[PDB]
Amino acid sequence: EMEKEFEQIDKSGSWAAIYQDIRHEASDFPCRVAKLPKNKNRNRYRDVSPFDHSRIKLHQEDNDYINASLIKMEEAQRSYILTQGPLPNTCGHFWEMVWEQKSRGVVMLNRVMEKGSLKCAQYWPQKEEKEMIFEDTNLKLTLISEDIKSYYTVRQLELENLTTQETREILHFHYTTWPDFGVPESPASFLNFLFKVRESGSLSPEHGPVVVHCSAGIGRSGTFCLADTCLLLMDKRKDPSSVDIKKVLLEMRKFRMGLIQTADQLRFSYLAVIEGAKFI
Ligand SMILES: [Mg+2]
DSSP states (O other): OHHHHHHHHHHHTOHHHHHHHHHHHSOOOOOHHHHSGGGGGGOSOTTOOOOTTTEEEOSOSSOOEEEEEEEEETTTTEEEEEEOOOOTTSHHHHHHHHHHTTOOEEEEOSOSEETTEEOSOOOSOSSTTSOEEETTTTEEEEEEEEEEOSSEEEEEEEEEETTTOOEEEEEEEEEOOOOSSSOOSOSHHHHHHHHHHHHTTTTSTTSOOEEEESSSSSSHHHHHHHHHHHHHHHHHSSOGGGOOHHHHHHHHTTTSTTOSOSHHHHHHHHHHHHHHHHHO
């Protein structure tokens, strides 16, 4: 049981040391495209960049850059795109990526404002009758419906490629109750949220990869993908107790840097996987 590992780390007060060792073991790959001067305004944070090998490329000759990475989990047979929260000038790029990658779902794990600062642009329309047009990427986006619950909001959006007039329905799953500081006390509502995303078909292989973000696209987004993958692997393997969350995290870190940003996020991820395993 990773629960016995969990209790052991708790009693010995070693979360910080376990987390720092993951930081030390983590892959280091170049982010040369990200660091090009012409892309400075396409990155929110100077210390959060997509690796070149796993970056999502926009299908355009001018500038193909977006701060987004494909995390491809072979054994679990799950793929996720992790990205930063859109910036005022990269909302058109964001929706272009969603279109070109054939994503069905977008998972948002932050509020537009937290700690009194803007953590991303308002990249989706708040009213049915006030649609958004992204002129740079020739896309139209329309709020079709919105269902606000206590811990999350799910929206249906229609995305139209104005060039070909094709439309698609995108589901927007917005977790709205992650605290400004720290992690949630109990993983129950986060797990419920994950199950709602799963139930929608947004994580399924008949669609492109789900797009997941918070402000930077590594902390809470890492937590979401790490929990999902670990739980899938416990369902798939002959020996479920062989699923090692540290090894999965390190594997995911081959595709995007810095996934899980604090020791508290690590502890929380353990908690989510443990409680989620017991529910299943
Ligand atoms: Mg109205």
